[PDB]
Amino acid sequence: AVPPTYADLGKSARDVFTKGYGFGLIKLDLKTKSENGLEFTSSGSANTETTKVTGSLETKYRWTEYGLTFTEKWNTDNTLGTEITVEDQLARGLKLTFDSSFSPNTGKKNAKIKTGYKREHINLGCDMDFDIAGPSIRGALVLGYEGWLAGYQMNFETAKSRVTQSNFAVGYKTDEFQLHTNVNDGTEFGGSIYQKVNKKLETAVNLAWTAGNSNTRFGIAAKYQIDPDACFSAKVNNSSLIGLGYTQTLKPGIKLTLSALLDGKNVNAGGHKLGLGLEFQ
Amino acid sequence: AVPPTYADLGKSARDVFTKGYGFGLIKLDLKTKSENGLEFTSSGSANTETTKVTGSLETKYRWTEYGLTFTEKWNTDNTLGTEITVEDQLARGLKLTFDSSFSPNTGKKNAKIKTGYKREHINLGCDMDFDIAGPSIRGALVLGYEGWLAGYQMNFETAKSRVTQSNFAVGYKTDEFQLHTNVNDGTEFGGSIYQKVNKKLETAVNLAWTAGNSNTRFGIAAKYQIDPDACFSAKVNNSSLIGLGYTQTLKPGIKLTLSALLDGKNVNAGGHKLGLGLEFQA
Description:
Chain B: It is a multi-pass membrane protein. The structure is a homodimer. Chain A has one helix at 11-18, and strands spanning 25-33, 38-47, 53-63, 68-75, 80-87, 94-103, 108-119, 122-129, 136-145, 148-157, 162-173, 177-184, 188-196, 201-210, 217-225, 230-237, 242-251, 254-262, 273-280. Chain A is mainly beta. Chain A has a single domain, classed as Beta Barrel (Porin). The first copy, chain A, has a 19-stranded mixed barrel. In chain A, a hairpin with a 5-residue loop joins strand 2 and strand 3 (53-63). The longest helix of chain A has 8 residues, at 11-18. The interface between A and B is medium-sized, with 23 and 25 residues.
């Protein structure tokens, strides 16, 4: 029972809401990996409302002999990034990342070190940000006990010399069922349930509210694998939004996604959104 | 009066026949540009007959301070490409290109140098191929005189130590009218007329025939810009083929193209070819 990281608590439920939908976008993804050396991933995204087209490239080299990864990122905003990762090297479940960022636009340099350790019942992490205008430290811990999970997460900004962030999470996790709750900063409350109902159906419910407002946001979602080549997603929330999504494998390694978003009661009148995605592996 | 390269002779006419038609293909293109910085194009292409789907990614970086371009291509068939170009560097109208291809799939490695020089009345070029299985040299010249144009073009394959290609062209060229003719290898004869009739209409006629066969192939084509948002193309040839093409700007930066190709006999009762393109531009 190696538990997930603090950030991965409630992930499954989040995935049923997010994957298989891309509203107001034409998305194009190209991925290829070579035997042992390089790998390349590129994405293009055109926003049909803003007429803005975005692009990104990632180049990855895995030295599988020494648990090393070297990654280079580059996007349309001219941002460059580089990342070096060592995993399972000094000890099993240990991971050390060095990450550097550069902006030719602004000349903004950033550097980060990320460290992790995980093993049976425990998942820990510590990220160090060496910002010029105030370094910080993020620390997180998840403990596992017979399907139960408890996490704590905090951020310390050295400039203010003050904790600026304090989050708790509590949950229960099997492969077929997942209960997640959290309170951020004594202020934001979230809750979710995920269910793998059978081989073909996944479902999820989400709840969110805020101390000092009587209101509640909630939503319900599903994913249905019709056959091995076709997949349907549907969701609704109490802001009156409907999402629909359809994914079809055209050929091995090629998937086409169509998605739609509705608003209010004009389910035949108002301004909806469309989306189209194409993924190539 | 700087003349076009040998390859660009008759281009305008060829463009009226080729552009705005994509039969048997579903195309999706996403493009973004920076005059200063770089440009990016990514593409998806399905052949509706072969069920073959292609995907591509091109990156271009212009260092406008030193007349440099760097271009990178990558596709789904695993092919990689690289091209570096220097222009107007040592002298105005001089251009030098280094070109490399590599295939992890076909292992095929190819390298090329291309050189050019152009100025008033003259356009010359020399491309050098450093293939393992036979280096080759392509040389071309176009000379201009008062609207008239004459070109010669040849290829020498060092492996056979023999000229494998010898082409002549003669034309007349203004901005509204273009006459082009050529004979390849003393064997293939081509001729074309292009006309920019007005702001909205372009038209073209093509002729081709072969030494030792009495037959002739010809075609007529047109391009009509209806308004700034809509564009129609139509063509026919004497093999009884009809091409139709329609392009519509749906929103600024988004164009949709539909095309159809019909065979003669079954004009409205057989299997014809359709095509669909969507272009997204920043």
